[PDB]
Design a protein around this ligand. Structure first.
Ligand SMILES: *[C@@H]1O[C@H](CO)[C@@H](O[C@@H]2O[C@H](CO)[C@@H](O)[C@H](O)[C@H]2NC(C)=O)[C@H](O)[C@H]1NC(C)=O
Ligand SMILES: *[C@@H]1O[C@H](CO)[C@@H](O[C@@H]2O[C@H](CO)[C@@H](O)[C@H](O)[C@H]2NC(C)=O)[C@H](O)[C@H]1NC(C)=O
Ligand SMILES: *[C@@H]1O[C@H](CO)[C@@H](O)[C@H](O)[C@H]1NC(C)=O
Lengths: 516, 141
């Protein structure tokens, strides 16, 4: 398998395996045979079950240990029953001995006679018999032993036969390793197992291209070549996600903002990522995101114009009401701003801004409802209002069609006083009066009303004259007599304050109407 | 070197006269070896300008007709003409008892037969072949 590394394979030594047999003749003998795999192979066999005392050695070549410290030996063999060998009473055996010795000398020519160290006595589980030969049943044993901790460049293996009848079908020698692997986005190298069969080897991992360490990546290598329970991890950098044991760049149309984010997601509504490995999505044409933001959250737009603009008015006060636009963009942060102006026959947009101490209750700006009440403004002028539908964007794309206008003509109230009333001509019986238009008509002046009486409280009669013009002639008065005059104006809202008293005394100048 | 036992060597190619009248035969004793060598060439030789065959151990009837089918057992593959160190070698011990389960046994005074088919695969009425007579114990001891 992937966790075993071969140091010796008898079947695989295609350049013929050269082993020392001692004795060189009459002991272990190499002999040709057909295996479990039907391959023709040379193997060693011995069957001297009829001699009193037997000591037959067979020793491998020098076997370099590489770096291993715990080496396994897997022997496949057949051993025959001493029952099935006729008249072998006393000496026949059913076991063989297994040895090794360590050496840096790869050319030790002669089997050591002392220095060998017994690994084990190997017995069979399926000793064979005449019948098996008869029927071509190959009762094949497998035994594994292991040795170490090994310290020298190499070792030899040996087999001693003391009287069995046995055939070595294969010898394979190997060590174990935990294979190169990636766990929690860290890479761990091929790692040779430790010195004992209970040894763990600590291995520090390396963060995969391209990812960042969260906790230090570590894993343990088990004696059996299985990686044991890991600790630590790496996280895929922003714009990358974990697939297999790699951090791959996010696909086109996908993005990942931080390393701490799970996988790539697709770009939310009205954003797009044109490159792989995208940490953000570039908003689509005409779309934006507010300072209060998440790149996760979809991009939005300035709304349409607000709808059903609906005006109410009192004499010198405008109350306004409208409805949510057709397209919000959309978002819940929609608000409205009110804008005041002043025009007339100046259709061209020639409108001084009216800026004043008006209100505008509750707000005038950043308004959450669909109502606003304007107060403290002048009576007979055409005001214009723009209501603007706003949101968290549109500061990034303003435009007059995010608003709708109402040109409105105000209400009228009763006028100011006149202040200047003059006597134009005085005769013995008449007073001709003339006055100016009040400073603030507060509307269309319909007529004027003159109130007069004698200055003296005794014999005083209050009289009234009406006119459309700003002048009148009071006739039929007492000569050389002092009178008082007041003038007021009228609009549909009512009467203005009477003017400051004008005192005029008739003279003795003859009336030309009277003549003679 | 030491021996009690003899080893018969046999070079199996068609260049070898002992094969000519199809009557190559050896007398062996028990525990003798027969070593058949395969045909083996120079590195600079095309592997098809090359003799290669499969060796089969078969009974008399299949010794007669050059036929392994239903006659005996495959034993060796001579297909590796550039074998790394020397020619490919098949060893046979003429033993009483096999230590191998699917090995082979021989009795004195009995006689045993080998034939071969080529890797050219040609259906032959003609094959290189060998008869082995295992002597009586009273010609050995
Ligand atoms: C307020 O606005 C209008 C202009 O929009 C002024 O005059 C208007 O002129 C049209 C003819 O073009 C006439 O219908 C009226 O004379 C006015 N319009 C309306 C609806 O009455 C008007 O004088 C302005 N008002 C003030 C106080 O300045
Ligand atoms: C073909 O077989 C012949 C003999 O039939 C082989 O010749 C022998 O080769 C061996 C080993 O190298 C020598 O020790 C013998 O003395 C040779 N005998 C003769 C007559 O030459 C020959 O090598 C075989 N070769 C091939 C390539 O198949
Ligand atoms: C005009 O309306 C305002 C606000 O509603 C109010 O304060 C004011 O008294 C009103 N004037 C009237 C009804 O004549």
């Amino acid at each position: 398998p992937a966790n075993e590394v071969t140091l010796l394979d008898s079947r695989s030594v295609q350049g013929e395996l050269g082993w020392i047999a001692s004795p060189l003749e009459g002991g272990w003998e190499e002999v040709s045979i057909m295996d479990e795999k039907n391959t023709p192979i040379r193997t060693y066999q011995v069957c001297n079950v009829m001699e009193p005392s037997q000591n037959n050695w067979l020793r491998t070549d020098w076997i370099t240990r590489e770096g291993a410290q715990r080496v396994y030996i897997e022997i496949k063999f057949t051993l025959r029953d001493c029952n099935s060998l006729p008249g072998v009473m006393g000496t026949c055996k059913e076991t063989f001995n297994l040895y090794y010795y360590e050496s840096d000398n790869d050319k030790e020519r002669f089997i050591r006679e002392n220095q060998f160290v017994k690994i084990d006595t190997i017995a069979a589980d399926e000793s064979f018999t005449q019948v098996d030969i008869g029927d071509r049943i190959m009762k094949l044993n497998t035994e594994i032993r292991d040795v170490g901790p090994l310290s020298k460049k190499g070792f030899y293996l040996a087999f001693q036969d003391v009287g069995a009848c046995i055939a070595l079908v294969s010898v394979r020698v190997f060590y174990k390793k935990c294979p190169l692997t990636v766990r929690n986005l860290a890479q761990f190298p091929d790692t040779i197992t430790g010195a004992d069969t209970s040894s763990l080897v600590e291995v520090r991992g390396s963060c995969v291209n391209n990812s960042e360490e969260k906790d230090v990546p570590k894993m343990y290598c088990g004696a059996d070549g299985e990686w044991l329970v890991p600790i630590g991890n790496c996280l895929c950098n922003a714009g990358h996600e974990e697939r297999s044991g790699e951090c791959q760049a996010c696909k086109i149309g996908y993005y990942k903002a931080l390393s701490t984010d799970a996988t790539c997601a697709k770009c939310p509504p009205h954003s797009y990522s044109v490159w792989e490995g995208a940490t953000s999505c570039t908003c689509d044409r005409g779309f934006f995101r507010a300072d209060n933001d998440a790149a996760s959250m979809p991009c939005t737009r300035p709304p349409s114009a607000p709808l059903n603009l609906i005006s109410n008015v009192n004499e010198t006060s405008v109350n306004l009401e409208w409805s949510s636009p057709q397209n919000t963009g959309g978002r819940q942060d929609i608000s409205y701003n009110v804008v005041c102006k002043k025009c007339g026959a100046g259709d061209p947009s020639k409108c001084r801004p009216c800026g004043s101490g008006v209100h505008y209750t509750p707000q005038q700006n950043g308004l959450k409802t669909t109502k606003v009440s304007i107060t403290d403004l002048l009576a007979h002028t055409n005001y214009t209002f723009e209501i603007w539908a706003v949101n968290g964007v549109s500061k990034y794309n303003p435009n007059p069609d995010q608003s709708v206008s109402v040109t409105v003509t105000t209400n009228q109230a009763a006028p100011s006083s006149i202040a200047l009333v003059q006597a134009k001509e005085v005769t013995r019986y008449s007073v001709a009066l003339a006055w100016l238009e009040p400073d603030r008509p507060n509307g269309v002046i319909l007529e004027y009303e003159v109130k007069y009486y004698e200055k003296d409280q005794n014999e005083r009669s209050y009289r009234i004259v009406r006119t459309a013009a700003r002048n009148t002639d009071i006739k039929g008065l007492n000569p050389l007599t002092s009178y008082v005059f007041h003038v007021r104006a009228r609009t549909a809202a009512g009467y203005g304050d009477f003017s400051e008293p004008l005192e005029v005394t008739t003279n003795t100048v003859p009336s030309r109407i009277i003549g003679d | 070197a030491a021996a009690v036992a003899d080893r018969y060597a046999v070079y199996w190619n068609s260049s070898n006269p002992r094969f000519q009248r199809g009557d190559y035969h050896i007398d062996v004793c028990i525990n003798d070896y027969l070593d058949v060598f395969c045909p083996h060439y120079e590195d600079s030789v095309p592997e098809d300008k090359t003799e290669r065959y499969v060796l089969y151990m078969v009974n008399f009837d299949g010794y007669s007709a050059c036929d392994h089918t239903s006659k005996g057992f495959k034993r060796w593959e001579c297909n590796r003409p550039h074998s790394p160190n020397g020619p490919l070698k098949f060893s046979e011990k003429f033993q009483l008892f096999t230590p191998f389960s699917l090995g082979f046994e021989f009795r004195p005074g009995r006689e045993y037969f080998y034939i071969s088919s080529a890797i050219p695969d040609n259906g032959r009425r003609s094959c290189l072949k060998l008869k082995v007579f295992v002597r009586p114990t009273n010609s050995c001891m």
